[PDB]
Amino acid sequence: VHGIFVSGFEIGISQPSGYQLYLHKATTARLRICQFPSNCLFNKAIPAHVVGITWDNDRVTVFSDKIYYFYFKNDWSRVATAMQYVYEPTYYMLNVTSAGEDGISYQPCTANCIGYAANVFATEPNGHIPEGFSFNNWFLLSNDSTLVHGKVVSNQPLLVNCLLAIPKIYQFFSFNQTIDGVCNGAAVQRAPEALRFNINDISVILASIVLHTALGTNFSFVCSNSSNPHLATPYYCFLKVDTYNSTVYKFLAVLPPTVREIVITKYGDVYVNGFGYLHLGLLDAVTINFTGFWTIASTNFVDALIEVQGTAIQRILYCDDPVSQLKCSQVAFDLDDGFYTIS
C-alpha cells in the first residue's frame, strides 16, 4: 500500500537498518520517522484534525494540514495502523482561481497527466518554485564539469518571475521588459535574466529560435535531417549568423538524441542539458516561432542551496529569508540547536 489515509488513531509504515514511520493522533499528530525496533530522521508534532502519508521513490509526503516533504532513500512495501489503502496512483487537474479552499475544480485528468504534473507548477508570490516540485527537466547550469552528488550553494536562474505552461506561440521575449503571456500562479513584474525552456517535443522547433544581440546580429538555430540546400559545402545544427551585410552558417553540433532543457541568458550563454555549450555577446531578446514546450519561464539569478543526486535536482532552498541565509552558510537544510554566527 503506497498510500495510507484516514477519515487514538495511528499509522505504521515498514519495509531494519533504515527508517520506518509511525504517526499517532487523538480526538495534532506526533510524527516519528526513526530506526524503530521490531536515532530519528524526524521526531516532532504536526498540526492535524483527511490525514495521510504517501511515499514513492525516495520521497515521503505527509498530509496533515501543511504538506510535508521528507527526502530519504526509504524502502517501504506494506503499512499497518474509514481507511484507504492505496496501491495505484491517480491524477487530477486543479483549477485554482480563487486563492482559497474553494478551488474551482479537481477535474479527473485525462491526458498527458504524468508529463503535465512533472513539469508544470504554480509560482509562489515571492518567485519561489514551490516545495515539492520535481525539477523533472531542470538542470544546474555549469560551464564545466557536473556535480554528480552533494550539496552546493550556487547562483542559478531559479527565481521565477513568470511561468507559461503549455505555451502556444504561433513571441518576442525581451530581456528588458516582462514576458507577455498568462503566468501560472503568481507573477513578478521583472524582466528575465534568463529564459528557461522545458522541452516536450523538440521536433516542433526543428521542423525557430533567434537570439537578438545588442549590436544587431541575429543568431538563428537551424537544424536539419538529410537536407542541406544551403548548408552543404540525425539532425545537424548550424548557427546562422545573420548581420546586416552578411549571412553565414557555422556548424555547431550534431543534435544530442534527447534535449530536455535549453537556457538562454541575457549575457548570451546557451545551455542545453546544463553544459554551457555556446557563449555569444549580450542579448536584447529571444524570438520564438513555431506552430513543443512544457513550460517557458522567465527567471532571475539567486543564491540557492541545491541538493544534487545523480546530477538531478532536488530540495532547493532559496537564500532569501534570514533563517535560510543561515542554512545556506552552514550548507545544510537542517541545522541542530546551537549558536551560529550571522551578520
Ligand X SMILES: *[C@@H]1O[C@H](CO)[C@@H](O[C@@H]2O[C@H](CO)[C@@H](O)[C@H](O)[C@H]2NC(C)=O)[C@H](O)[C@H]1NC(C)=O
Ligand Y SMILES: *[C@@H]1O[C@H](CO)[C@@H](O[C@@H]2O[C@H](CO)[C@@H](O[C@@H]3O[C@H](CO[C@H]4O[C@H](CO[C@H]5O[C@H](CO)[C@@H](O)[C@H](O)[C@@H]5O)[C@@H](O)[C@H](O)[C@@H]4O[C@@H]4O[C@H](CO)[C@@H](O)[C@H](O)[C@H]4NC(C)=O)[C@@H](O)[C@H](O[C@H]4O[C@H](CO)[C@@H](O)[C@H](O)[C@@H]4O[C@H]4O[C@H](CO)[C@@H](O)[C@H](O)[C@@H]4O)[C@@H]3O)[C@H](O)[C@H]2NC(C)=O)[C@H](O)[C@H]1NC(C)=O
Ligand Z SMILES: CCCCCC/C=C\CCCCCCCC(=O)O
Terminal CA-CA length for the chain: 48
Q: Which of 56, 33, 59 is nearest to 46 (CA)?
A: 33
Output 29 or 120, the one with its CB closest to ligand NAG: 120
Contacts with another protein in 141-180 (CB under 8 A)? 142, 144-146, 148, 153-155
Q: Among 14, 217, 273, 287, which residue interacts with another protein (rule: CB under 8 A)?
A: 273
Interface with ligand Z, residue 338, by CB under 6 A: yes
User: Least Å distance between CB 142 and another protein?
Assistant: 6
Q: What's phi and psi for 303, nearest 5 deg?
A: -75, 135
Q: Which of 162, 272, 285, 313 is close enough to bind ligand Z by CB under 6 A? A: 272
Amino acid (1-letter code) at residue 179: I
Alpha-carbon separation of residue 335 from 30, 152, 185, 246, 328 (angstroms):
21, 16, 31, 58, 10
Cα 110 to Cα 87, 93, 115, 116, 198: the distances in Å are: 20, 9, 12, 11, 22
Q: Applying CB under 6 A, does 95 fall inside the site for ligand NAG?
A: yes
Task: Round to whole Å and give the CA distance between 278 and 257.
Answer: 18
- Asked if residue 196 lies in contact with residue 261, where contact means CB atoms within 8 angstroms, the answer is yes
Among 59-67, 102-110, 220-228, 275-283, which window interacts with ligand Y (CB under 6 A)?
275-283
Q: Which residues, numbered 173-192, are part of the site for ligand Y (CB under 6 A)? A: 191
Q: Is 212 in the site for ligand X (CB under 6 A)?
A: yes
**Window 32-91: residues binding another protein (CB under 8 A):** 34-35, 39-40, 43
Q: Smaller CB distance to ligand NAG: residue 143 or 177?
A: 177
DSSP 215: T
Number of residues that bind another protein (CB under 8 A): 46
Q: Report, in Å, the least distance between residue 266 CB and ligand X.
A: 17
1 and 79 in contact (C-beta within 8 Å)?
A: yes
Cell of 228: 542541406
Length of the chain: 343
Partner residues linked to 59 by β-bridges: 56, 71
Q: At residue 124, what is the residue type?
A: E
Extract the C-alpha cell encoding 201. Answer: 517535443
Q: Are 277 and 237 in contact (CB under 8 A)?
A: no
Q: By beta-carbon distance, which residue lies closest to ligand X? A: 218
252 within 8 A of 144, measured Cβ to Cβ: no
* x-or-dash string of contact with another protein, 310-339, rule CB under 8 A: xxx---------------xxxx------xx
Among 29, 41, 53, 141, binds ligand Y (CB under 6 A): 141
From candidates 194, 278, 297, 306, binder to another protein by CB under 8 A? 278
- With binding defined as CB under 6 A, does residue 284 bind ligand Y? no
Instruction: From the list another protein, ligand X, ligand Y, none, pick the one residue 282 interacts with, judged by a Cβ distance below 5 to 8 Å according to partner type.
Output: ligand Y
72 touching ligand Y, by CB under 6 A: no
255 binds ligand Z (CB under 6 A): yes
Question: Is position 244 an interface residue for ligand X (rule: CB under 6 A)?
Answer: yes
Query: Under the criterion CB under 6 A, does residue 237 sit at the interface with ligand Z?
Result: yes
| Residue in 251, 282, 289, 323 binding another protein, rule: CB under 8 A | 251
Q: Does 330 bind ligand Y (CB under 6 A)?
A: no
In this structure, what C-alpha cell is assigned to residue 272?
542545453
The reply to whether 259 sits near another protein by the rule CB under 8 A is: no
What does 269 bind: ligand Z, ligand Y, ligand NAG, none (CB cut-off 5 to 8 Å by kind)?
ligand Y
Residue 53: alpha-carbon gap to chain centroid: 23
At residue 110, φ and ψ (nearest 5 deg) are -110, -15
3-state class (DSSP) for residue 297: strand
Collapse the DSSP code of 117 into the 3-class scheme (helix H, G, I; strand E, B; otherwise coil) and give the result.
helix
Number of residues lying near ligand Y (CB under 6 A): 12
Nearer to ligand X, 61 or 213 (CB): 213
Q: What residues make contact with ligand X under the rule CB under 6 A?
A: 172, 212, 216-218, 242-244
